[PDB]
Design an enzyme around this catalytic site. Structure first.
Site, short mmCIF file in Angstrom:
data_model
loop_
_atom_site.label_atom_id
_atom_site.label_comp_id
_atom_site.label_asym_id
_atom_site.label_seq_id
_atom_site.Cartn_x
_atom_site.Cartn_y
_atom_site.Cartn_z
N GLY A 153 1.51 2.19 8.70
CA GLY A 153 1.47 1.68 7.51
C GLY A 153 0.24 1.86 6.54
O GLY A 153 -0.64 1.98 7.28
N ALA A 168 0.85 -1.33 -0.07
CA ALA A 168 0.05 -0.11 0.20
C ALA A 168 0.87 1.18 -0.07
O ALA A 168 0.34 2.42 0.11
CB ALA A 168 -0.82 0.17 1.22
N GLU A 175 -14.42 -9.62 29.15
CA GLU A 175 -14.04 -9.27 30.46
C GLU A 175 -12.95 -7.95 30.34
O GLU A 175 -13.14 -7.08 31.08
CB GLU A 175 -13.31 -10.19 31.27
N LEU A 221 -12.49 -12.46 26.22
CA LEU A 221 -12.31 -11.10 25.70
C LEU A 221 -13.33 -10.13 26.02
O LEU A 221 -12.93 -8.77 26.34
CB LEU A 221 -12.55 -11.18 24.16
#
Ligand SMILES: Nc1nc2c(ncn2[C@@H]2O[C@H](COP(=O)(O)OP(=O)(O)OP(=O)(O)O)[C@@H](O)[C@H]2O)c(=O)[nH]1
Ligand SMILES: Nc1ncnc2c1ncn2[C@@H]1O[C@H](COP(=O)(O)OP(=O)(O)CP(=O)(O)O)[C@@H](O)[C@H]1O
Ligand SMILES: Nc1nc2c(ncn2[C@@H]2O[C@H](COP(=O)(O)OP(=O)(O)O)[C@@H](O)[C@H]2O)c(=O)[nH]1
Ligand SMILES: COC(=O)Nc1nc2cc(C(=O)c3cccs3)ccc2[nH]1
Ligand SMILES: [Mg+2]
Ligand SMILES: [Mg+2]
Ligand SMILES: [Mg+2]
Lengths: 54, 344, 423, 439
Positions: free
Chosen positions: D143, D99, D254, D252
């Site tokens: 990036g 990119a 939590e 996740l």
């Protein structure tokens, strides 16, 4: 200085200490944005090719 | 060559510091928005502390301590003294004070009145002064004090008025003492050896708190309203040599013994209290700052702290020495080139 | 695989291009026969960027050699590394371009351009993933200037999404072949403004001054000038050719160097400028920012840097390199724009060039380059106001209006630089 | 047991992900060939480490991970690296042309052509999960791929996995270790587009990691390899609760419940201690009080800022090694009386503490010394808004002149997206100021 919710296992333990108490875009909409950007790229390239054809 | 930027054009002190820096042939002044500076002489308000110390390879220094406002705002100072165990509500060198928000806006209204009534019933002198960050009202009636603050819009402080100040002779006149204190990047506390008394030129009149010319010692008030301005001393400014000689001749004591010991104690207490909150010892940038402490003296030679100014001006005849001192202790100590202070 | 296709056009373009391939062939360990004989696998890691592999571990430059007369390419084919090029990649006519932009761009060049594109297409079709193109040429002649910019336009039509970079030798009255060089260069500059992503501006006057004032050469030749260009091109392409901290293709390199599309004309520099005393990092850094090491004959102190890149080659201290770059920027703090944060970047490559323990190459995008275009514009106008030497061009079908427009275009370019110099 | 899928996007994400999975294998006793002798349930199991590793019938433990990059050179080093046998080809996705540090190129031009392949490879991993928790996404801000493709992927993940949580580990740009200049653009653009799709994001400023590596590891000029080993230690501290038995941060969801009361303000500050040089002959081991106190030194934070001049909304202390609750409480009580720790009025002044008895694992022959105890503090403080202010100011300097904007418009992005993204950041800075500052 209160310790609450103390849990213990063989791997470790966990707890909580309290020092003081208190007082989306859809698949269709994403495709449209992606295709609108692609169409602007196409228009800008077509203008370049027209310029070079002149 | 070292590089610096100027972001407060209205600073008499750092306009002179800027001058001295150039005259060393080793400091270059950049445009105010250039980030690749070594030294920032910052603006008084909303200084972008969060953008300092992120330029690769540059040691960056600023002339203000982030968080020092706690000491240099009138309501903030009252709260700091009351809520800090180092200082405590029993602090003996700070006049009894209370924070009072205007009713059209926590607040200490009922706590002030509780102490006010205790003084009235006890026949004790009950004169208070309301002020904030003109805008001053000295009254012995609580009703006139609370009504004055409500007409305003910002937070105010009601403070016990020193009814028994030390009066210079001749003149029977009030005064206050300004001390300049420099705190460097290592949090050394330097007291400038030269202070100034901002004297009143009108006789002190305890029977008329309406005419605020013998009660308010501000230089601007004396220059505009006092018809005896400059009578006894040039510009109503008495310096330590004369004041010390007066204390010896009139009171058989010295400025050091009777007053300066208390001043040094108060300065050290205030600045040591806030040190953990503002120290830049292990920060990615470093701070120094010049402070103006204002003191009152009562007839018992007791010293009271009145306020701390975070952006002080200097006495005309003292700019040269003090500003050079700032360069030597605060700047060149971090950017060396190729004492007038007392270390507390 | 980040292939680059190289094109060299006209006398200057082919002579500087030939030197470029001698230099980097030596760096990659390729001998005049195209056989590898290096001592480090670092030399082959990115060999594919500029070379194709043939049978028997043979490496052939991805190079296309173009001219409207056979003379200079006969010299190349007889040169030191002349046998390394693909014979099918020599494309040349017989008539010449007579130092005439119109002949290169509209008449003689028009007849040859299709055969050049055929070769370019063949080289591109065998690229895994083409990075882009580089062209070497002069702007003061006819083939490199007129046919070179014609080629660039036809390449952009066929490969519009590919980077196009040029190493462009700017004419100077002090090192001149004909008086029409300002006409040819003004016509070419407008083509470059529109159709290149980077143009390295190499002023023959600067090259001459360096050879005379600095290298102490009483009588510099085109060969001496071209040794400086060869060395500069090696350094500019170092991060593409050797493993290092940079893994950027041509597009990423241009993105971070070109903030405005038309302002892509770079002032290149090199240090050390040709001794057995290796230079210290402080000396490398000071000299590469020195105007005397610049190759565009523009004083950087007269403008402002939009962006700067510098690549250091050799075994040296990254920390000291970083320290010295900080020192140079404070001395030039007034000469960097403040609205592009962190606009000075550096890279290091462990492999030094031949005959040096360390070196540095400088790439500056500075608004001071407007001095170069002003010089050309002045020389153009001094002749055009009297329509002098125009018959050489109208005789090939051009009319005065196209000269008037080229003049207006370059005065606009100068104005655009002045705008950002005051921002 | 509920699985977690890790997604590594762009060079920064791929190289950090490579460092993390190496460390995970060392922590769980998994050899480079994928074999794990201590796992007695061959070809299966629902142990805690199975949240990150699936198992083949042959006993190979395969990361639940996808690596995505738009050019192949960085992922090729995973294919041919020490742990090549860990992954299979379907997990490693590479394009041909990157990119070019251009958000618009990663999001619109190239993203449009590869997004469906990436979702199909992720779907393959999801079809192997009995109860997928969600995703962990590693990428750089600066990036073109890390910024542009990540934000496109996050949008599609919200569509294809509406109920699943998504956490980020984001590398915040530092000029000391970057040769790019357009990174402020890419950072604001991706933050704007990702903000509503991320439940909790851990920012790591390369400037902070760089200076920790110079100051505490005595590395004169740290490389990405040095930086990533330290980052992977912090990442491991954060994810250990998902991979080992325990009761704090075990899923996740939590993380958001414990660290993010305000959905937009979901950028917790990470602090880690101790970082000790392995070259040091012998180091006196730091106590619980000393490493805990070090959690309130800006010099140890993943993002340089001054929490003394903000307010806390939540604080989690994650200990590894020889630590017992009594010493944690003793250390906390002491620090409350010496540090400036102000909580918001609508939150309890307290600490959630997690202790894992296994001390930190270090990569053999690395820069980090083995220590007997370490701690990572996750605190949601308004002070991290300083990092947004720095980034937004750099954005403003360049955008006022429209510098570099033509590169983005040239890939089909509209100029209005710049100002729209910048206004979202301005509103974010205002949210932080309302939460953490008194008049
Ligand atoms: N900590 C760390 N940062 C990295 C690493 N690699 C790159 N970066 C940072 O990431 C930013 C550059 O973005 P990249 O991740 O390299 O770009 P990308 O995601 O591959 O996108 P492209 O533009 O397509 O190459 C800069 O700020 C670098 O400093 C790494 O391995 N570790
Ligand atoms: N509690 C008190 N008792 C007696 N006198 C007082 C007092 N508070 C203030 N004063 C008098 O009022 C004057 C002005 O008070 P204050 O210090 O609030 O004004 P100010 O903020 O303008 C000082 P500066 O100009 O140095 O910032 C002082 O010089 C002092 O003489
Ligand atoms: N530096 C350098 N400049 C050259 C060389 N040959 C010609 N020039 C310059 O290039 C211009 C002439 O263009 P030239 O390449 O000879 O004409 P062409 O063959 O039609 O492209 C003049 O400005 C010359 O000074 C060379 O070998 N090196
Ligand atoms: C064939 O065209 C090029 O080689 N172009 C080119 N090479 C470059 C090298 C650099 C370079 O060496 C550095 C970039 C950042 C730090 S040094 C920069 C821009 C460039 N453009
Ligand atoms: Mg004041
Ligand atoms: Mg010629
Ligand atoms: Mg990349």
């Amino acid at each position: 200085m209160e310790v609450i919710e103390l849990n213990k296992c063989t791997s470790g333990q966990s707890f909580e200490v309290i020092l003081k108490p208190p007082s989306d875009p859809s698949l269709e909409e994403i495709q449209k944005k992606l295709e609108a950007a692609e169409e602007r790229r196409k228009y800008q390239e077509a203008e370049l090719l027209k310029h070079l054809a002149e | 060559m070292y590089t610096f930027v100027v972001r407060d054009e209205n600073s008499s002190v750092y306009a002179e510091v800027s001058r001295l820096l150039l005259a060393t042939g080793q400091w270059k002044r950049l445009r105010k928005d250039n980030p690749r500076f070594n030294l920032m002489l910052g603006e008084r308000n909303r200084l972008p502390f969060g953008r300092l110390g992120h330029e690769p390879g540059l040691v960056q220094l600023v002339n203000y301590y982030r968080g020092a406002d706690k000491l240099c705002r009138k309501a903030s100072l009252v709260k700091l003294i009351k809520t800090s165990p180092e200082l405590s509500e029993s602090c003996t060198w700070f006049p009894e004070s209370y924070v009072i928000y205007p009713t059209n806006l926590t607040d200490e209204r009922e706590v002030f009145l509780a102490a006010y009534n205790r003084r009235r019933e006890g026949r004790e002198g009950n004169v208070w002064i309301a002020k904030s960050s003109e805008g001053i009202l000295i009254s012995s009636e609580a009703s006139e004090l609370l009504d004055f603050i409500d007409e305003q819009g910002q937070v105010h402080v009601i403070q016990k008025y020193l009814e028994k100040p030390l009066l210079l002779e001749p003149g029977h006149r009030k005064f206050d003492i300004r001390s300049w204190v420099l705190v460097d990047h290592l949090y050394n506390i330097y007291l400038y050896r030269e202070g100034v008394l901002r004297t009143s030129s009108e006789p002190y009149n305890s029977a008329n708190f309406q005419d605020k010319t013998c009660h308010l010692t501000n230089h601007c008030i004396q220059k505009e309203y006092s018809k005896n301005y400059g009578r006894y001393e040039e510009g109503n400014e008495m310096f330590f040599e004369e004041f010390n000689q007066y204390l010896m001749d009139a009171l058989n004591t010295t400025l050091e013994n009777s007053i300066l010991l208390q001043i040094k104690h108060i300065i050290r207490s205030c600045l040591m209290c806030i040190e953990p909150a503002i120290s830049t010892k292990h920060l990615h940038y470093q701070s120094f700052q010049l402070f103006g402490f204002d003191f009152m003296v009562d007839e018992e030679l007791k010293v009271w702290l009145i306020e701390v100014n975070g952006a002080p001006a200097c006495a005309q005849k003292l700019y040269a020495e003090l500003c050079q001192g700032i360069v030597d202790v605060a700047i060149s100590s971090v950017f060396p080139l190729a004492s007038i202070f007392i270390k507390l | 695989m980040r292939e680059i296709v190289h094109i060299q056009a006209g006398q200057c373009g082919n002579q500087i291009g030939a030197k470029f391939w001698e230099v980097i062939s030596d760096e990659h360990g390729i001998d005049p026969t195209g056989s590898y004989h290096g001592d480090s696998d670092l030399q082959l890691e990115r060999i594919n960027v500029y070379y194709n592999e043939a049978t028997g571990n043979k490496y052939v430059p991805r190079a296309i050699l173009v001219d409207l007369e056979p003379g200079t390419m006969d010299s190349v084919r007889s040169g030191p590394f002349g046998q390394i090029f693909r014979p099918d990649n020599f494309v040349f006519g017989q008539s010449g371009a007579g130092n005439n932009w119109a002949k290169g761009h509209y008449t003689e060049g028009a007849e040859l351009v299709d055969s050049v594109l055929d070769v370019v297409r063949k080289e591109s079709e065998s690229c895994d993933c083409l990075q882009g193109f580089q062209l070497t040429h002069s702007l003061g002649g006819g083939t490199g200037s007129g046919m070179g910019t014609l080629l660039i336009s036809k390449i952009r039509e066929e490969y519009p999404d590919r980077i196009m970079n040029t190493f462009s030798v700017m004419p100077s009255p002090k090192v001149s072949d004909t008086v029409v060089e300002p006409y040819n260069a003004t016509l070419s500059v407008h083509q470059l403004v529109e159709n290149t992503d980077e143009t390295y501006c190499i002023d023959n006057e600067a090259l001459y001054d360096i050879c005379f004032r600095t290298l102490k050469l009483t009588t510099p030749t085109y060969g001496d000038l071209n040794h400086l260009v060869s060395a500069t091109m090696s350094g500019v392409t170092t991060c593409l050719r050797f493993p290092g901290q940079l893994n950027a293709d041509l597009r990423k390199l241009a993105v971070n160097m070109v903030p405005f599309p038309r302002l892509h004309f770079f002032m290149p520099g090199f240090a050390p400028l040709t001794q057995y005393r290796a230079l210290t990092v402080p000396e490398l850094t000071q000299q590469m920012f020195d105007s005397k090491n610049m190759m565009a004959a523009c004083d950087p102190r007269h403008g402002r840097y939009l962006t700067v890149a510098a690549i250091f080659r050799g075994r040296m201290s990254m920390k000291e390199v970083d320290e010295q770059m900080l020192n140079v920027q404070n001395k030039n703090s007034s000469y960097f724009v403040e609205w592009i944060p962190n606009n000075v970047k550096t890279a290091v490559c462990d492999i030094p060039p031949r005959g040096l323990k360390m070196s540095a190459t400088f790439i500056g995008n500075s608004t001071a380059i407007q001095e170069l275009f002003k010089r050309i514009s002045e020389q153009f106008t001094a002749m055009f106001r009297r329509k002098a030497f125009l018959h050489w061009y109208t005789g090939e079908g051009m009319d005065e209006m196209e000269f008037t427009e080229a003049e207006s275009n370059m005065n606009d370019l100068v104005s655009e630089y002045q705008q950002y110099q005051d921002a | 047991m509920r699985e977690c899928i890790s997604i590594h996007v762009g060079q920064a994400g791929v190289q950090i992900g490579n460092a993390c999975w190496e460390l995970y294998c060392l922590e769980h006793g998994i050899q480079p060939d994928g074999q794990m002798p201590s796992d007695k349930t061959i070809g299966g199991g629902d142990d805690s480490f199975n949240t990150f590793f699936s198992e083949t019938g042959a006993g190979k433990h395969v990361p639940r991970a996808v690596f995505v990059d738009l050019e192949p050179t960085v992922i090729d080093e995973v294919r041919t690296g020490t742990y090549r046998q860990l992954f299979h080809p379907e997990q490693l996705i590479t394009g041909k042309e990157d990119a070019a540090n251009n958000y618009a190129r990663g999001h619109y031009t190239i993203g449009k052509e590869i997004i469906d392949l990436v979702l199909d490879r992720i779907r393959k991993l999801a079809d192997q999960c009995t109860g997928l928790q969600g995703f962990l996404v590693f990428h750089s801000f600066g990036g073109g791929t890390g910024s542009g493709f990540t934000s496109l992927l996050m949008e599609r993940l919200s569509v294809d996995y509406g109920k699943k949580s998504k956490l980020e580990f984001s590398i915040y740009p530092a000029p000391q270790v970057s040769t790019a200049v357009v990174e402020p653009y890419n950072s604001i653009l991706t933050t704007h587009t990702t903000l509503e799709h991320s439940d909790c994001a851990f920012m790591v400023d390369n400037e902070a990691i760089y200076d920790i590596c110079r100051r505490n590891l005595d590395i004169e000029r740290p490389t990405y390899t040095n930086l990533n080993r330290l980052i992977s230690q912090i990442v491991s501290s954060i994810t250990a609760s998902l991979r080992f038995d325990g009761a704090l941060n075990v899923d996740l969801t939590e993380f958001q419940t414990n660290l993010v009361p305000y959905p937009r303000i979901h950028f917790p500050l990470a602090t880690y201690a101790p970082v000790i040089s392995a070259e040091k002959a012998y180091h006196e081991q730091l106590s619980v009080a000393e490493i805990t106190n070090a959690c309130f030194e800006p010099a140890n934070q993943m993002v340089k800022c001054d929490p003394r001049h903000g307010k806390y909304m939540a604080c989690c202390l994650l200990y590894r090694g020889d630590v017992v609750p009594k010493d944690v409480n003793a250390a906390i009580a002491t620090i409350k009386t010496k540090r400036s720790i102000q909580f918001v009025d609508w939150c309890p002044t307290g600490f959630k503490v997690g202790i894992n008895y296994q001390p930190p694992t270090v990569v053999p022959g690395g820069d980090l010394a083995k220590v007997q105890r370490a701690v990572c503090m996750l605190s949601n403080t308004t002070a991290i808004a300083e990092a947004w202010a720095r980034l937004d100011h750099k954005f403003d300097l360049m955008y006022a002149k429209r510098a570099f904007v033509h590169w983005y418009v040239g890939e089909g992005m509209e100029e209005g997206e710049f100002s729209e993204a910048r206004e979202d950041m301005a509103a974010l800075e205002k949210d932080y100021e309302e939460v953490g500052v008194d008049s």
